[PDB]
Amino acid sequence: MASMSVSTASTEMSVRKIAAHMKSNPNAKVIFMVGAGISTSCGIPDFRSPGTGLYHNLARLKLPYPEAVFDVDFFQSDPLPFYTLAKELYPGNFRPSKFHYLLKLFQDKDVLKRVYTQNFDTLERQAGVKDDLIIEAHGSFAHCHCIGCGKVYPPQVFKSKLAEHPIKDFVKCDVCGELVKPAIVFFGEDLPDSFSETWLNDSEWLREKITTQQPLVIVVGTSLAVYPFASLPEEIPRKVKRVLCNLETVGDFKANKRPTDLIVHQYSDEFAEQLVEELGWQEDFEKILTA
Amino acid sequence: KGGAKRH
Ligand SMILES: NC(=O)c1ccc[n+]([C@@H]2CC(COP(=O)(O)OP(=O)(O)OC[C@H]3O[C@@H](n4cnc5c(N)ncnc54)[C@H](O)[C@@H]3O)[C@@H](O)[C@H]2O)c1
Ligand SMILES: [Zn+2]
């Protein structure tokens, strides 16, 4: 939970512009669009990084390259790399960051319209963000289905396999015989229907507020390289203010930058602490932290 | 919808 600024430069002033826009439009709400950057301070090992215990266990197992672990044809051929990843990443093995708790503060103040997330942690929900405000664009472990017929399975049947030494005898469907997996969106599958359907309602909400008060969309801790999520920032209305809190300028904010775009080069946890101070909400934050 | 999860 302690943070520091990324460089000698202060970002307090940029962050103060953000707080200034919410003080001027006090019943306006914010849409957040987040990725793996916001969960780095929680100690979630990156499966692409050498140097993690996960990476070396997956290499030992003959995984050809990291993202094969999220590839349906590979999993069908050999489910063990996926099961080993799950055993290490499964919810309940980490705790939410100070950034995750900022979202829950924004909900308590009724200024959260929706969070769109690329992460399959579920730390937004664990932190107490309501179901109706979350869109887990790449799925989670909380549902499971037969890859062959779609039959539904409680998540606990897959869970119970991961506590076994060694892991063998994978979940198989009692109707068709194919593998059952978690509802994690693998590369090459479509996203859940609620992704497109809710962005459709929220795109319409963004346009209608510019003609009345004014809304804010803040993108944090993502490289905007995975589609179709990363088509979102380009689809934000021309007249709706966009903020990027990211170690680097990426995506549509580097390709096609907009006069009102605000870029803040800062660690998501440090961003959270500066925003809460520039908002005046120190007291209700502190209390959420110590529960 | 946007297509399938890709780079
Ligand atoms: N927690 C998770 O569910 C999780 C963990 C590890 C990898 N992933 C992969 C990540 C992913 C989506 O790409 P994505 O979100 O864009 O990941 P990414 O790893 O490609 O990029 C994260 C971005 O955030 C930046 N970053 C890293 N730490 C911080 C920080 N503390 N504060 C601000 N910015 C930071 C960084 O500059 C980078 O562009 C998927 O394909 C996943 O499979 C998800
Ligand atoms: Zn089946």
mmCIF file of C-alpha atoms and ligand atoms in Angstrom:
data_model
loop_
_atom_site.group_PDB
_atom_site.id
_atom_site.type_symbol
_atom_site.label_atom_id
_atom_site.label_comp_id
_atom_site.label_asym_id
_atom_site.label_seq_id
_atom_site.Cartn_x
_atom_site.Cartn_y
_atom_site.Cartn_z
ATOM 1 C CA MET A 1 0.000 0.000 0.000
ATOM 2 C CA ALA A 2 2.803 2.806 0.236
ATOM 3 C CA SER A 3 3.595 4.651 -3.018
ATOM 4 C CA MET A 4 6.035 7.107 -4.587
ATOM 5 C CA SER A 5 6.092 9.299 -7.584
ATOM 6 C CA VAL A 6 7.596 7.841 -10.713
ATOM 7 C CA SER A 7 10.004 10.731 -11.370
ATOM 8 C CA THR A 8 11.224 14.045 -9.986
ATOM 9 C CA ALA A 9 8.416 15.922 -11.856
ATOM 10 C CA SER A 10 5.296 16.598 -9.789
ATOM 11 C CA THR A 11 1.903 15.530 -11.361
ATOM 12 C CA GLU A 12 -0.047 17.201 -8.472
ATOM 13 C CA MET A 13 -0.990 20.055 -10.986
ATOM 14 C CA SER A 14 -2.306 17.929 -13.787
ATOM 15 C CA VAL A 15 -4.267 15.990 -11.107
ATOM 16 C CA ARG A 16 -5.623 19.209 -9.710
ATOM 17 C CA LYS A 17 -7.109 19.933 -13.267
ATOM 18 C CA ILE A 18 -9.165 16.657 -12.818
ATOM 19 C CA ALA A 19 -10.391 17.545 -9.427
ATOM 20 C CA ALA A 20 -11.217 20.997 -10.846
ATOM 21 C CA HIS A 21 -13.473 19.526 -13.528
ATOM 22 C CA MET A 22 -15.467 17.476 -10.878
ATOM 23 C CA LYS A 23 -15.871 20.434 -8.461
ATOM 24 C CA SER A 24 -17.388 22.451 -11.498
ATOM 25 C CA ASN A 25 -19.785 19.485 -12.464
ATOM 26 C CA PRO A 26 -20.737 17.933 -9.087
ATOM 27 C CA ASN A 27 -23.609 15.374 -10.202
ATOM 28 C CA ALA A 28 -21.572 14.303 -13.255
ATOM 29 C CA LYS A 29 -20.007 10.773 -13.108
ATOM 30 C CA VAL A 30 -16.816 9.165 -14.461
ATOM 31 C CA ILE A 31 -16.276 6.033 -16.668
ATOM 32 C CA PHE A 32 -12.934 4.215 -15.959
ATOM 33 C CA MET A 33 -11.240 1.875 -18.475
ATOM 34 C CA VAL A 34 -8.442 -0.118 -16.795
ATOM 35 C CA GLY A 35 -5.850 -2.927 -17.368
ATOM 36 C CA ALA A 36 -2.985 -4.842 -15.699
ATOM 37 C CA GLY A 37 -1.073 -1.718 -14.564
ATOM 38 C CA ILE A 38 -3.658 -1.199 -11.676
ATOM 39 C CA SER A 39 -2.988 -4.677 -10.214
ATOM 40 C CA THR A 40 0.879 -4.597 -10.354
ATOM 41 C CA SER A 41 1.188 -3.249 -6.789
ATOM 42 C CA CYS A 42 -0.856 -6.192 -5.567
ATOM 43 C CA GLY A 43 2.016 -8.586 -6.427
ATOM 44 C CA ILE A 44 0.087 -10.511 -9.242
ATOM 45 C CA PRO A 45 2.933 -12.280 -11.129
ATOM 46 C CA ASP A 46 2.933 -11.555 -14.933
ATOM 47 C CA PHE A 47 2.893 -14.945 -16.864
ATOM 48 C CA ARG A 48 4.934 -13.119 -19.714
ATOM 49 C CA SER A 49 7.792 -12.180 -17.393
ATOM 50 C CA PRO A 50 10.883 -14.379 -16.880
ATOM 51 C CA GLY A 51 11.836 -14.004 -13.399
ATOM 52 C CA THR A 52 8.346 -14.960 -12.047
ATOM 53 C CA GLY A 53 7.929 -18.536 -10.629
ATOM 54 C CA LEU A 54 4.843 -18.851 -12.961
ATOM 55 C CA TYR A 55 6.811 -18.151 -16.135
ATOM 56 C CA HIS A 56 9.375 -20.821 -15.273
ATOM 57 C CA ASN A 57 6.799 -23.479 -14.289
ATOM 58 C CA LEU A 58 4.940 -22.868 -17.678
ATOM 59 C CA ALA A 59 8.254 -23.101 -19.612
ATOM 60 C CA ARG A 60 9.164 -26.393 -17.749
ATOM 61 C CA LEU A 61 5.716 -27.701 -18.848
ATOM 62 C CA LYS A 62 6.538 -27.022 -22.611
ATOM 63 C CA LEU A 63 4.196 -24.149 -23.089
ATOM 64 C CA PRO A 64 5.538 -22.916 -26.515
ATOM 65 C CA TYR A 65 4.954 -19.185 -25.745
ATOM 66 C CA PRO A 66 3.048 -17.345 -22.929
ATOM 67 C CA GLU A 67 -0.197 -16.444 -24.627
ATOM 68 C CA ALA A 68 -0.785 -20.154 -25.702
ATOM 69 C CA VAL A 69 -2.098 -20.552 -22.183
ATOM 70 C CA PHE A 70 -5.149 -18.530 -23.375
ATOM 71 C CA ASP A 71 -5.568 -20.419 -26.668
ATOM 72 C CA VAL A 72 -8.492 -22.824 -26.983
ATOM 73 C CA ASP A 73 -6.795 -25.280 -29.381
ATOM 74 C CA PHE A 74 -3.741 -25.534 -27.145
ATOM 75 C CA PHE A 75 -5.764 -25.978 -23.941
ATOM 76 C CA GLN A 76 -7.765 -28.824 -25.666
ATOM 77 C CA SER A 77 -4.461 -30.558 -26.549
ATOM 78 C CA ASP A 78 -3.012 -30.066 -23.092
ATOM 79 C CA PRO A 79 -4.862 -28.342 -20.167
ATOM 80 C CA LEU A 80 -2.099 -28.553 -17.532
ATOM 81 C CA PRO A 81 -0.303 -25.136 -18.255
ATOM 82 C CA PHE A 82 -3.763 -23.421 -17.867
ATOM 83 C CA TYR A 83 -4.584 -25.297 -14.652
ATOM 84 C CA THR A 84 -1.131 -24.395 -13.161
ATOM 85 C CA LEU A 85 -1.696 -20.658 -14.025
ATOM 86 C CA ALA A 86 -5.141 -20.886 -12.359
ATOM 87 C CA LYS A 87 -3.767 -22.382 -9.225
ATOM 88 C CA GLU A 88 -1.362 -19.456 -8.840
ATOM 89 C CA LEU A 89 -3.860 -16.592 -9.994
ATOM 90 C CA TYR A 90 -7.085 -17.788 -8.548
ATOM 91 C CA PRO A 91 -9.077 -15.043 -6.655
ATOM 92 C CA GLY A 92 -8.554 -14.889 -3.144
ATOM 93 C CA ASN A 93 -4.859 -15.172 -3.281
ATOM 94 C CA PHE A 94 -4.258 -11.331 -3.497
ATOM 95 C CA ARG A 95 -5.683 -8.146 -2.003
ATOM 96 C CA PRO A 96 -6.951 -4.989 -3.700
ATOM 97 C CA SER A 97 -4.702 -1.925 -4.266
ATOM 98 C CA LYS A 98 -5.289 1.655 -3.088
ATOM 99 C CA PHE A 99 -6.485 2.322 -6.761
ATOM 100 C CA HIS A 100 -9.106 -0.430 -6.501
ATOM 101 C CA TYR A 101 -10.367 1.200 -3.214
ATOM 102 C CA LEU A 102 -10.606 4.639 -5.116
ATOM 103 C CA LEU A 103 -13.252 3.095 -7.323
ATOM 104 C CA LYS A 104 -15.187 1.966 -4.244
ATOM 105 C CA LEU A 105 -14.902 5.569 -2.793
ATOM 106 C CA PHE A 106 -16.258 7.009 -6.130
ATOM 107 C CA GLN A 107 -19.245 4.602 -5.827
ATOM 108 C CA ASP A 108 -19.908 5.628 -2.151
ATOM 109 C CA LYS A 109 -20.005 9.322 -3.422
ATOM 110 C CA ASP A 110 -22.292 8.249 -6.369
ATOM 111 C CA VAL A 111 -19.728 9.499 -8.995
ATOM 112 C CA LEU A 112 -19.091 6.075 -10.688
ATOM 113 C CA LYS A 113 -20.980 5.468 -13.885
ATOM 114 C CA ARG A 114 -19.080 2.176 -14.842
ATOM 115 C CA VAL A 115 -15.607 0.544 -14.739
ATOM 116 C CA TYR A 116 -14.554 -1.438 -17.855
ATOM 117 C CA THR A 117 -11.687 -3.856 -17.010
ATOM 118 C CA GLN A 118 -9.331 -6.097 -19.038
ATOM 119 C CA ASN A 119 -8.153 -7.922 -15.796
ATOM 120 C CA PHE A 120 -9.409 -11.416 -14.722
ATOM 121 C CA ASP A 121 -8.337 -10.807 -11.052
ATOM 122 C CA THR A 122 -11.840 -9.452 -10.073
ATOM 123 C CA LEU A 123 -10.162 -7.112 -7.573
ATOM 124 C CA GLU A 124 -12.774 -4.419 -8.415
ATOM 125 C CA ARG A 125 -15.491 -6.634 -7.160
ATOM 126 C CA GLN A 126 -13.480 -8.001 -4.227
ATOM 127 C CA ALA A 127 -12.961 -4.440 -3.169
ATOM 128 C CA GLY A 128 -16.810 -3.979 -3.010
ATOM 129 C CA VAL A 129 -17.651 -2.329 -6.464
ATOM 130 C CA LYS A 130 -21.238 -3.305 -7.284
ATOM 131 C CA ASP A 131 -22.112 -5.882 -9.969
ATOM 132 C CA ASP A 132 -24.193 -3.384 -12.034
ATOM 133 C CA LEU A 133 -21.143 -0.991 -12.291
ATOM 134 C CA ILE A 134 -18.544 -3.536 -13.487
ATOM 135 C CA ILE A 135 -17.840 -4.903 -16.930
ATOM 136 C CA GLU A 136 -15.237 -7.735 -16.915
ATOM 137 C CA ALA A 137 -14.524 -7.547 -20.545
ATOM 138 C CA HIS A 138 -12.232 -10.681 -20.503
ATOM 139 C CA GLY A 139 -14.350 -12.785 -18.198
ATOM 140 C CA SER A 140 -13.354 -14.250 -14.750
ATOM 141 C CA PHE A 141 -13.268 -17.480 -12.812
ATOM 142 C CA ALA A 142 -16.739 -16.985 -11.219
ATOM 143 C CA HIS A 143 -18.558 -18.993 -14.036
ATOM 144 C CA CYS A 144 -17.593 -22.225 -15.869
ATOM 145 C CA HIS A 145 -18.943 -23.932 -18.989
ATOM 146 C CA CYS A 146 -18.413 -27.037 -21.244
ATOM 147 C CA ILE A 147 -16.354 -25.855 -24.310
ATOM 148 C CA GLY A 148 -18.212 -28.458 -26.412
ATOM 149 C CA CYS A 149 -21.990 -28.067 -25.434
ATOM 150 C CA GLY A 150 -22.134 -25.008 -23.176
ATOM 151 C CA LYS A 151 -23.480 -26.921 -20.245
ATOM 152 C CA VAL A 152 -23.083 -24.803 -16.993
ATOM 153 C CA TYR A 153 -20.920 -25.937 -14.005
ATOM 154 C CA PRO A 154 -20.402 -24.243 -10.577
ATOM 155 C CA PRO A 155 -16.920 -22.692 -10.321
ATOM 156 C CA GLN A 156 -16.157 -24.775 -7.309
ATOM 157 C CA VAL A 157 -15.785 -28.035 -9.390
ATOM 158 C CA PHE A 158 -12.790 -26.548 -11.258
ATOM 159 C CA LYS A 159 -11.459 -24.976 -8.108
ATOM 160 C CA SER A 160 -11.319 -28.264 -6.217
ATOM 161 C CA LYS A 161 -8.986 -29.745 -8.841
ATOM 162 C CA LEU A 162 -6.269 -27.106 -8.229
ATOM 163 C CA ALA A 163 -5.729 -28.199 -4.627
ATOM 164 C CA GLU A 164 -4.455 -31.694 -5.773
ATOM 165 C CA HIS A 165 -0.747 -32.976 -5.835
ATOM 166 C CA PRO A 166 0.052 -33.351 -8.652
ATOM 167 C CA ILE A 167 -2.760 -31.692 -10.706
ATOM 168 C CA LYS A 168 -4.281 -34.485 -12.985
ATOM 169 C CA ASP A 169 -7.812 -35.750 -14.067
ATOM 170 C CA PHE A 170 -9.191 -32.460 -15.462
ATOM 171 C CA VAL A 171 -12.890 -31.463 -15.358
ATOM 172 C CA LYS A 172 -14.888 -33.103 -18.153
ATOM 173 C CA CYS A 173 -18.506 -32.617 -19.084
ATOM 174 C CA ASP A 174 -21.009 -35.317 -18.084
ATOM 175 C CA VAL A 175 -23.170 -34.747 -21.168
ATOM 176 C CA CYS A 176 -20.564 -34.435 -24.102
ATOM 177 C CA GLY A 177 -17.138 -35.442 -22.567
ATOM 178 C CA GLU A 178 -15.223 -32.180 -23.581
ATOM 179 C CA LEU A 179 -13.182 -30.041 -21.163
ATOM 180 C CA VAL A 180 -14.963 -27.622 -18.901
ATOM 181 C CA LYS A 181 -13.150 -24.272 -18.573
ATOM 182 C CA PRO A 182 -13.674 -20.919 -16.527
ATOM 183 C CA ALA A 183 -15.406 -18.105 -18.331
ATOM 184 C CA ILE A 184 -12.093 -16.401 -19.131
ATOM 185 C CA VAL A 185 -12.115 -14.925 -22.730
ATOM 186 C CA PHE A 186 -9.274 -16.626 -24.484
ATOM 187 C CA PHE A 187 -7.448 -15.107 -27.653
ATOM 188 C CA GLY A 188 -9.591 -15.836 -30.642
ATOM 189 C CA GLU A 189 -13.018 -15.865 -28.768
ATOM 190 C CA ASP A 190 -15.584 -13.217 -28.699
ATOM 191 C CA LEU A 191 -16.133 -11.056 -25.636
ATOM 192 C CA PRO A 192 -19.358 -11.590 -23.461
ATOM 193 C CA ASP A 193 -22.432 -9.822 -25.028
ATOM 194 C CA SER A 194 -22.778 -7.457 -22.045
ATOM 195 C CA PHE A 195 -19.475 -5.766 -23.197
ATOM 196 C CA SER A 196 -20.862 -4.375 -26.477
ATOM 197 C CA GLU A 197 -24.400 -3.956 -25.110
ATOM 198 C CA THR A 198 -23.299 -1.763 -22.122
ATOM 199 C CA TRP A 199 -20.824 0.248 -24.189
ATOM 200 C CA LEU A 200 -23.694 0.962 -26.591
ATOM 201 C CA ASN A 201 -25.858 2.437 -23.595
ATOM 202 C CA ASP A 202 -22.841 4.306 -22.140
ATOM 203 C CA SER A 203 -21.770 5.760 -25.588
ATOM 204 C CA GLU A 204 -25.372 7.063 -25.932
ATOM 205 C CA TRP A 205 -25.156 8.452 -22.303
ATOM 206 C CA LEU A 206 -21.866 10.232 -23.069
ATOM 207 C CA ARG A 207 -23.282 12.020 -26.198
ATOM 208 C CA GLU A 208 -26.481 13.130 -24.365
ATOM 209 C CA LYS A 209 -24.677 14.813 -21.453
ATOM 210 C CA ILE A 210 -22.699 17.140 -23.785
ATOM 211 C CA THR A 211 -26.022 18.691 -24.819
ATOM 212 C CA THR A 212 -27.798 19.642 -21.386
ATOM 213 C CA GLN A 213 -23.482 17.902 -16.455
ATOM 214 C CA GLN A 214 -20.160 17.279 -18.196
ATOM 215 C CA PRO A 215 -18.796 13.572 -17.846
ATOM 216 C CA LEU A 216 -15.124 12.360 -17.621
ATOM 217 C CA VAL A 217 -13.604 9.099 -18.931
ATOM 218 C CA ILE A 218 -10.220 8.099 -17.264
ATOM 219 C CA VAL A 219 -8.089 5.263 -18.849
ATOM 220 C CA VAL A 220 -5.500 3.741 -16.420
ATOM 221 C CA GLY A 221 -2.703 1.096 -16.474
ATOM 222 C CA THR A 222 -3.254 -0.264 -19.954
ATOM 223 C CA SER A 223 -1.116 -0.499 -23.148
ATOM 224 C CA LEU A 224 -4.325 -0.409 -25.357
ATOM 225 C CA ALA A 225 -2.994 -3.252 -27.517
ATOM 226 C CA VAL A 226 -5.594 -5.848 -27.149
ATOM 227 C CA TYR A 227 -8.682 -5.568 -29.284
ATOM 228 C CA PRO A 228 -11.625 -5.080 -29.160
ATOM 229 C CA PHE A 229 -11.171 -3.335 -25.839
ATOM 230 C CA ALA A 230 -8.630 -0.988 -27.137
ATOM 231 C CA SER A 231 -11.104 0.425 -29.748
ATOM 232 C CA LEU A 232 -12.888 2.109 -26.864
ATOM 233 C CA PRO A 233 -10.871 5.312 -26.285
ATOM 234 C CA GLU A 234 -11.201 6.246 -30.024
ATOM 235 C CA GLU A 235 -14.982 5.904 -29.684
ATOM 236 C CA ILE A 236 -15.199 8.409 -26.785
ATOM 237 C CA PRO A 237 -17.117 11.571 -27.991
ATOM 238 C CA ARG A 238 -15.013 14.332 -29.421
ATOM 239 C CA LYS A 239 -16.404 16.750 -26.797
ATOM 240 C CA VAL A 240 -16.059 14.405 -23.753
ATOM 241 C CA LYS A 241 -12.808 15.075 -21.891
ATOM 242 C CA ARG A 242 -10.317 12.090 -21.877
ATOM 243 C CA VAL A 243 -7.605 11.484 -19.137
ATOM 244 C CA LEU A 244 -4.686 8.840 -19.375
ATOM 245 C CA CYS A 245 -2.903 7.796 -16.244
ATOM 246 C CA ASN A 246 -0.190 5.460 -17.650
ATOM 247 C CA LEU A 247 3.577 5.155 -17.426
ATOM 248 C CA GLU A 248 3.696 5.736 -21.143
ATOM 249 C CA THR A 249 1.611 7.540 -23.834
ATOM 250 C CA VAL A 250 -0.205 4.686 -25.823
ATOM 251 C CA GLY A 251 -3.062 3.887 -28.167
ATOM 252 C CA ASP A 252 -5.247 6.572 -29.539
ATOM 253 C CA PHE A 253 -3.671 9.098 -27.096
ATOM 254 C CA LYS A 254 -0.320 8.784 -29.044
ATOM 255 C CA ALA A 255 -1.855 8.271 -32.549
ATOM 256 C CA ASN A 256 -4.560 10.894 -32.670
ATOM 257 C CA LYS A 257 -4.235 13.227 -29.773
ATOM 258 C CA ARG A 258 -6.925 15.763 -28.878
ATOM 259 C CA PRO A 259 -6.498 19.338 -27.588
ATOM 260 C CA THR A 260 -8.476 18.616 -24.326
ATOM 261 C CA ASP A 261 -6.620 15.124 -23.670
ATOM 262 C CA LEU A 262 -4.901 15.171 -20.365
ATOM 263 C CA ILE A 263 -1.791 12.842 -20.057
ATOM 264 C CA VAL A 264 -0.595 12.005 -16.493
ATOM 265 C CA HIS A 265 2.627 9.835 -16.438
ATOM 266 C CA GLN A 266 2.182 8.369 -12.880
ATOM 267 C CA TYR A 267 1.762 5.012 -10.953
ATOM 268 C CA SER A 268 -1.870 4.231 -10.499
ATOM 269 C CA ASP A 269 -1.551 4.091 -6.705
ATOM 270 C CA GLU A 270 0.214 7.489 -6.455
ATOM 271 C CA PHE A 271 -2.579 8.926 -8.928
ATOM 272 C CA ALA A 272 -5.158 7.626 -6.415
ATOM 273 C CA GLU A 273 -3.568 9.279 -3.380
ATOM 274 C CA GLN A 274 -3.049 12.708 -5.266
ATOM 275 C CA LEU A 275 -6.680 12.610 -6.536
ATOM 276 C CA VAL A 276 -8.227 11.881 -3.170
ATOM 277 C CA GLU A 277 -6.156 14.780 -1.640
ATOM 278 C CA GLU A 278 -7.045 17.146 -4.508
ATOM 279 C CA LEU A 279 -10.772 16.144 -3.985
ATOM 280 C CA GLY A 280 -10.879 16.668 -0.211
ATOM 281 C CA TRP A 281 -11.995 13.056 0.427
ATOM 282 C CA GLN A 282 -8.984 12.132 2.732
ATOM 283 C CA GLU A 283 -11.237 11.276 5.644
ATOM 284 C CA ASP A 284 -13.762 8.721 3.984
ATOM 285 C CA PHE A 285 -10.747 7.160 2.075
ATOM 286 C CA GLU A 286 -8.639 6.628 5.210
ATOM 287 C CA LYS A 287 -11.652 4.873 6.739
ATOM 288 C CA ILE A 288 -12.226 2.562 3.742
ATOM 289 C CA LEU A 289 -8.452 1.666 3.900
ATOM 290 C CA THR A 290 -8.564 0.520 7.596
ATOM 291 C CA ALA A 291 -11.635 -1.759 7.425
ATOM 292 C CA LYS B 1 -19.605 -6.596 -31.552
ATOM 293 C CA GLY B 2 -16.013 -5.790 -32.451
ATOM 294 C CA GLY B 3 -14.563 -9.173 -33.319
ATOM 295 C CA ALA B 4 -12.578 -11.706 -31.313
ATOM 296 C CA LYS B 5 -9.935 -11.013 -28.672
ATOM 297 C CA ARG B 6 -6.771 -10.122 -30.593
ATOM 298 C CA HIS B 7 -3.682 -7.963 -30.994
HETATM 299 N N1 LIG C 1 -4.327 -8.869 -13.314
HETATM 300 C C1 LIG C 1 -4.552 -9.463 -14.586
HETATM 301 O O1 LIG C 1 -5.799 -10.025 -14.979
HETATM 302 C C2 LIG C 1 -3.490 -9.544 -15.628
HETATM 303 C C3 LIG C 1 -2.095 -9.751 -15.127
HETATM 304 C C4 LIG C 1 -0.956 -9.847 -16.060
HETATM 305 C C5 LIG C 1 -1.099 -9.749 -17.513
HETATM 306 N N2 LIG C 1 -2.551 -9.535 -17.976
HETATM 307 C C6 LIG C 1 -2.564 -9.447 -19.468
HETATM 308 C C7 LIG C 1 -2.786 -8.110 -19.721
HETATM 309 C C8 LIG C 1 -3.697 -7.989 -20.798
HETATM 310 C C9 LIG C 1 -4.131 -6.647 -21.282
HETATM 311 O O2 LIG C 1 -3.048 -5.709 -21.671
HETATM 312 P P1 LIG C 1 -2.987 -4.740 -20.522
HETATM 313 O O3 LIG C 1 -3.890 -4.221 -19.573
HETATM 314 O O4 LIG C 1 -3.041 -3.647 -21.523
HETATM 315 O O5 LIG C 1 -1.566 -4.981 -20.158
HETATM 316 P P2 LIG C 1 -0.166 -4.558 -20.410
HETATM 317 O O6 LIG C 1 0.676 -5.407 -19.541
HETATM 318 O O7 LIG C 1 0.071 -4.839 -21.846
HETATM 319 O O8 LIG C 1 0.115 -3.100 -20.142
HETATM 320 C C10 LIG C 1 0.017 -2.374 -18.849
HETATM 321 C C11 LIG C 1 0.392 -0.919 -19.050
HETATM 322 O O9 LIG C 1 0.307 -0.169 -17.824
HETATM 323 C C12 LIG C 1 1.502 0.504 -17.523
HETATM 324 N N3 LIG C 1 1.795 0.149 -16.086
HETATM 325 C C13 LIG C 1 2.440 -0.914 -15.406
HETATM 326 N N4 LIG C 1 2.423 -0.722 -14.036
HETATM 327 C C14 LIG C 1 1.746 0.500 -13.837
HETATM 328 C C15 LIG C 1 1.346 1.347 -12.671
HETATM 329 N N5 LIG C 1 1.608 1.024 -11.417
HETATM 330 N N6 LIG C 1 0.616 2.621 -12.862
HETATM 331 C C16 LIG C 1 0.265 3.091 -14.199
HETATM 332 N N7 LIG C 1 0.605 2.352 -15.353
HETATM 333 C C17 LIG C 1 1.345 1.065 -15.110
HETATM 334 C C18 LIG C 1 2.473 0.207 -18.560
HETATM 335 O O10 LIG C 1 3.125 1.400 -19.069
HETATM 336 C C19 LIG C 1 1.763 -0.677 -19.517
HETATM 337 O O11 LIG C 1 1.488 0.016 -20.778
HETATM 338 C C20 LIG C 1 -4.094 -9.199 -21.284
HETATM 339 O O12 LIG C 1 -3.796 -9.852 -22.589
HETATM 340 C C21 LIG C 1 -3.785 -10.128 -20.108
HETATM 341 O O13 LIG C 1 -3.745 -11.383 -20.528
HETATM 342 C C22 LIG C 1 -3.740 -9.433 -17.047
HETATM 343 ZN ZN ZN C 2 -21.039 -30.678 -22.746
#
